[PDB]
Amino acid sequence: PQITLWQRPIVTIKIGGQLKEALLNTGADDTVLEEVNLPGRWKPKLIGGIGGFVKVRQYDQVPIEICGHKVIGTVLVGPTPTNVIGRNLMTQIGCTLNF
Amino acid sequence: PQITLWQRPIVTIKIGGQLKEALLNTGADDTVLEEVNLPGRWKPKLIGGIGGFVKVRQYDQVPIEICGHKVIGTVLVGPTPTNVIGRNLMTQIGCTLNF
């Protein structure tokens, strides 16, 4: 786990053989990570949309471990001010908002 | 409630005598709402920082009801692509991430 929100909800993840940190972001539809070299197929995707769009590489069905939970989901790879775990992967780990 | 994340976590809020909807956004430090006329004192605040800054009005200790929970917190008022409830108000309502 139960994560209170007094601080930014940053968690450890394992992706593409690397250990990284990312922000659990319920405001983000998608997961965007930078500086990961993923194997297998990808397609370009345009995201954002304020001031223009940002092009990232979309990798589907990527195995990823998030705070000890081994799951699968789409990961967008490209430049991002902060590594973000979006709703698409929070659903996979069974993460809910509770109050 | 327990809110799953398959859809965007949009909730009803009551602010400044108006009913509005806003997104529960764990990636946002602050709460930003547009088209509200709040009474009492404010100061300008610069937020964002990508491409420049956005100037908003900071109102402290604003009474707000969020999905039935009457709380108090800082509300930034200015144009925002989507009304956002940030961590500052999620802590007030006792909202946690759970998995």
């Binding site: 922000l23 972001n25 405001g27 983000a28 539809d29 998608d30 995707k45 995201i47 954002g48 949309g49 001010p81 902060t82 973000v84 979006g86 | 997104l23 956004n25 990636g27 946002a28 430090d29 602050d30 930003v32 937020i47 964002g48 920082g49 692509p81 989507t82 956002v84 940030g86």
Partner: peptide, 7 residues
């Protein structure tokens, strides 16, 4: 910071 998104 402050981070929503739409794909």
């Amino acid at each position: 910071l402050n981070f929503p998104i739409s794909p």
